Amino acid sequence: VFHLFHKLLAGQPLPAEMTLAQLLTLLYDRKLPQGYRSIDLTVKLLLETCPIQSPLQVFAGMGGLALIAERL
């Protein structure tokens, strides 16, 4: 069995169905610098976490999509 680990989440195998958005949520909650170039995992041998907000989600949460619809 292969398990993915992150240094911030020390000594904790990551669930195989987490998806990278949820992992980014964890790492940002764990003080990983925002916009860090890459997710550095270790292949050795939390699913409820919300996915990180997409740019579209932020744009809509600021009401941008209503602005788009007024120009469609």
UniProtKB/Swiss-Prot annotation:
Organism: Homo sapiens
Cellular localization per UniProt: Golgi apparatus, trans-Golgi network membrane; Endosome; Cytoplasm, Cytoskeleton, Spindle pole; Cytoplasm, Cytoskeleton, Microtubule organizing center, Centrosome
Superkingdom of the source species: Eukaryota
Function of the protein: Anti-apoptotic protein known as inhibitor of apoptosis (IAP) which can regulate cell death by controlling caspases and by acting as an E3 ubiquitin-protein ligase. Unlike most IAPs, does not contain a RING domain and it is not a RING-type E3 ligase. Instead acts as a dual E2/E3 enzyme that combines ubiquitin conjugating (E2) and ubiquitin ligase (E3) activities in a single polypeptide. Ubiquitination is mediated by a non-canonical E1 ubiquitin activating enzyme UBA6.
Family statement: Belongs to the BIRC6 family.
PTM statement from Swiss-Prot or TrEMBL: Ubiquitinated; mediated by RNF41 E3 ligase and leads to proteasomal degradation, impairing inhibition of apoptosis. Deubiquitinated by USP8/UBPY. Autoubiquitinated; mediated by E1 ubiquitin activating enzyme UBA6.
Record note on quaternary structure: Homodimer; antiparallel. Interacts with RNF41. Interacts with DIABLO/SMAC, likely with higher affinity to SMAC dimer than SMAC monomer; this interaction blocks the substrate-binding site and inhibits the caspase inhibition activity of BIRC6. Interacts with KIF23/MKLP1, USP8/UBPY, BIRC5/survivin, MAP2K1/MEK1, RAB8A/RAB8, RAB11A/RAB11, PLK1, EXOC3/SEC6 and EXOC4/SEC8.
Residues of the full protein shown: 3964 to 4087 of 4857
The protein, known as: Dual E2 ubiquitin-conjugating enzyme/E3 ubiquitin-protein ligase BIRC6
